[PDB]
Design a protein around this ligand. Structure first.
Ligand code: D32
Ligand code: B7G
Length: 262
């Protein structure tokens, strides 16, 4: 087992470095000022940032709240695309039935995504694009409800998550575990997913005992954060449904539309 585990963790860590445009290692040095980000904090900085300083269009919007809402959708779509390629490299994810892969992604990407935004976060805002911009929490608290309500819970999750001091090597296995979940609805081969998931959790448990020797309780602490993410994402989807019911001008990217189908 043990040399298997260490090498299974290595391959997952490699898949992660290979597939994600941003790492917490790069985020954390930018945010501390070892590695500059353009500060987005109102209409005119968003315009500046989108005119090439941060991004290189969007469905028409009529106000800054919808506009940011659509910027959030762009990111999520970009993160879903990279999460898919990451997963296509986790051991034997690739060998599940193609529909179970899709089901596992349909139902786990927003949990993974919310774990990973956290890497980009400090109490005051978060890095965006690939570290080229910094959006202030005050600007986002300023948007009108329901938009600002759907954003703030992610900063609350993020800061507490960051208090645990995970690094990219840890997050690669955490994210793998969130995606290989035997209880998503509609899965066909539960036992096999459940089985890959158990190898992943044994790999993480091992990895955390090596990589974080003094944190004696980190492992069940991280199991609980996955449960916090499930609830965080329950809440999120209830707010997206509220926005769909009440803000009828606004639209949803087609991929998000499938993900949300039902
Ligand atoms: C942590 C934290 C704060 O929460 C977020 C932060 C981001 C980072 O991306 C942004 C990029 C640009 C902008 C800007 F500049 F337009 F303000 C804001 C945020 C992106 C998304 C979220 S939360 C989120 C995630 C997904 C999502 O909708 C798409 C979906 O649910 O599938 C929406 C509407 C939201 C609000
Ligand atoms: C890249 C993976 C992203 C996953 C998001 C796509 C999930 O949507 C589902 O895709 C299926 C097509 O296979 C349809 O049969 C379902 O009705 C639909 O809900």
């Amino acid at each position: 087992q043990v040399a298997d585990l260490k090498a299974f963790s290595k391959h997952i860590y490699n898949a992660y470095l290979k597939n994600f445009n941003m790492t917490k290692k790069k985020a954390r040095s930018i945010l501390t000022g070892k590695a500059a980000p353009f500060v987005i904090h109102d209409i005119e900085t968003l315009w500046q940032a989108e005119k090439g300083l941060v991004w290189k269009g969007l469905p028409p919007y009529k106000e800054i709240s919808v506009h940011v809402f659509y910027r959030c959708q762009c990111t999520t779509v970009e993160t879903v695309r990279e999460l898919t390629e990451f997963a296509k490299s986790i051991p034997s994810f690739g060998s599940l039935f193609l529909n179970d892969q899709v089901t596992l992604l349909k139902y786990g990407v927003h949990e993974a995504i919310f774990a990973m935004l956290a890497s980009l976060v400090n109490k005051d805002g978060l890095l965006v694009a690939n570290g080229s911009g910094f959006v202030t929490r005050e600007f986002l608290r300023s948007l009108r409800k329901p938009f600002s309500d759907i954003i703030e819970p992610k900063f609350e999750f993020a800061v507490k998550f960051n208090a645990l001091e995970l690094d990219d090597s840890d997050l690669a296995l955490f994210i793998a575990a969130i995606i290989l979940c035997g209880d998503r609805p509609g899965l066909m081969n539960v036992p096999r997913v459940e089985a890959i998931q158990d190898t992943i959790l044994r790999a993480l448990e091992f990895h955390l005992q090596a990589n974080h020797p003094d944190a004696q309780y980190l492992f069940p602490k991280l199991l609980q954060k996955m449960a916090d993410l499930r609830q965080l994402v329950t809440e999120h989807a209830q707010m997206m449904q509220r926005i769909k019911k009440t803000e009828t001008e606004t639209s949803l990217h087609p991929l998000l539309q499938e993900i949300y189908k039902d």
